[PDB]
From a paper:
We have been interested in a D-aminoacyl-tRNA deacylase (DTD) fold that is present across the domains of life in two different functional contexts: as an N-terminal editing domain (NTD) of archaeal ThrRS, which specifically removes non-cognate L-serine mischarged on tRNAThr, and as a freestanding ‘chiral proofreading' enzyme, which removes D-amino acids from tRNAs in bacteria and eukaryotes. Both share a striking structural and mechanistic similarity highlighting a common ancestry. Here we show, with the help of structural, biochemical and biophysical studies from three distant organisms, that the substrate specificity in this domain is determined by a differential remodelling of the catalytic centre at the RNA–protein interface rather than just the presence or absence of catalytic water as previously proposed. While demonstrating that the tRNA provides the catalytic group, we show that the side chains within the recognition site are dispensable for the proofreading function, suggesting a primordial mode of protein- or peptide scaffold-based enzymatic activity evolved alongside that of RNA.
On the other hand, the Lys to Met mutant, although showed partial activity against L-Ser-(Ec)tRNAThr in our earlier work, in subsequent studies with not only PabNTD K121M but also the corresponding K116M and K122M mutants of ApNTD and MjNTD with multiple batches of protein showed a severely compromised activity, suggesting a crucial role of this residue in enzyme function. However, a direct role of Lys in catalysis is still highly unlikely considering that this position is naturally occupied by a Met in the structural homologue DTD. We solved the crystal structure of K121M mutant of PabNTD and K116M mutant of ApNTD with L-Ser3AA and L-Thr3AA to investigate the structural basis of the observed loss of activity. A significant repositioning of the crucial catalytic water was observed upon mutation of the polar Lys side chain to the non-polar Met side chain, which is present in DTD. This provides a clear structural basis for the loss of function in this mutant, despite its high binding affinity for the substrate. Therefore, we show that Lys plays a crucial role in positioning the water molecule for catalysis rather than acting as a nucleophile.
Numbering used by the authors:
A (entry chain A): 1 to 143
B (entry chain B): 1 to 142
Write the structure that this text describes.
């Protein structure tokens, strides 16, 4: 898994078209979304993650949570970003892992948001630019 | 080298303060910048790249140019983004390679911009979200 964490003033997205044959079912009002003062977690689930979805998810939840705590981010946004890597995990498994990460962060007490899975999506973000506002994390199963 | 390419409506940046002991000298006007209808290339120069700066730079220029052509972009913006990777190359090497890429892209005839090297920087971007608007490349020398 490849994770790019961006502490932002906001994140705004706009669904433009389906990127998969069978994307995540959503309704019309979810075709646009936004979250303020948020740590955006751009995530690409990698093929190697299929080996152990649960372990990767738990570790992702831990790493993302640690950064949020550091920057005082109360809001976290899980953003499907497949092209952060080249070896992509299957969409069914990717979706599964992203759901687990979302569920895990919510359990940790954060106000978590997410963008629909399986779409071509436009987005606007404003990075605060502080010392820990831009961080990347590579998370893989215990090999 | 790690490269994140974002085809955007715009890229806007604001220098905060230095993140390295000796950053790229800058004038007041260089503290802020903006470019529109642009392919933004967030680049992280990695340790492995120190083995062959020219090679990595040449490949980066080629890859970036091919994408810009693919997405029909005439403007390209080189954005030093160290944290795209975990294994960073020396700053002196990172700066030289970033400068090589910037110039290589200009040589291709593109309208190219670049953000100052060595600073904590805030930025605003608007990704077009169309196909090919988000791509990444890992470039490693011989
Ligand atoms: C396209 C771009 O603008 C948009 N932002 C996008 O990335 N869309 C992705 C994710 O929503 C999801 N998806 C599929 N596979 C994966 C994966 N391995 N990891 C993460 N997401 C995936 O399916 C879409 C196409 O890959
Ligand atoms: C900090 C964040 O907001 C900002 N965006 C930033 O990344 N600043 C980086 C680059 O400008 C440059 N820099 C140092 N090493 C490298 C490297 N290996 N690759 C690219 N740039 C580097 O030095 C700064 C601190 O690492």
């Amino acid at each position: 898994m490849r994770v790019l964490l961006i502490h932002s003033d906001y994140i705004e997205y706009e669904v433009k078209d389906k990127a998969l044959k069978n994307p995540e079912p959503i309704s019309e009002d979810m075709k646009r979304g936004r979250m303020e003062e948020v740590l955006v977690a751009f995530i690409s689930v990698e093929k190697v993650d299929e080996k152990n979805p649960e372990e990767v998810s738990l570790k992702a939840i831990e790493e993302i949570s640690k950064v949020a705590e550091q920057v005082k981010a109360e809001n976290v946004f899980v953003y499907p970003f497949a092209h952060l890597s080249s070896e992509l995990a299957k969409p069914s498994v990717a979706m599964d892992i992203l759901n687990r990460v979302y569920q895990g962060l919510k359990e940790r007490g954060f106000n978590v948001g997410k963008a629909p899975f399986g779409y071509y999506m436009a987005f606007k973000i404003s990075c605060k630019g502080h010392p820990l506002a831009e961080l990347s994390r590579t998370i893989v199963p215990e090999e």
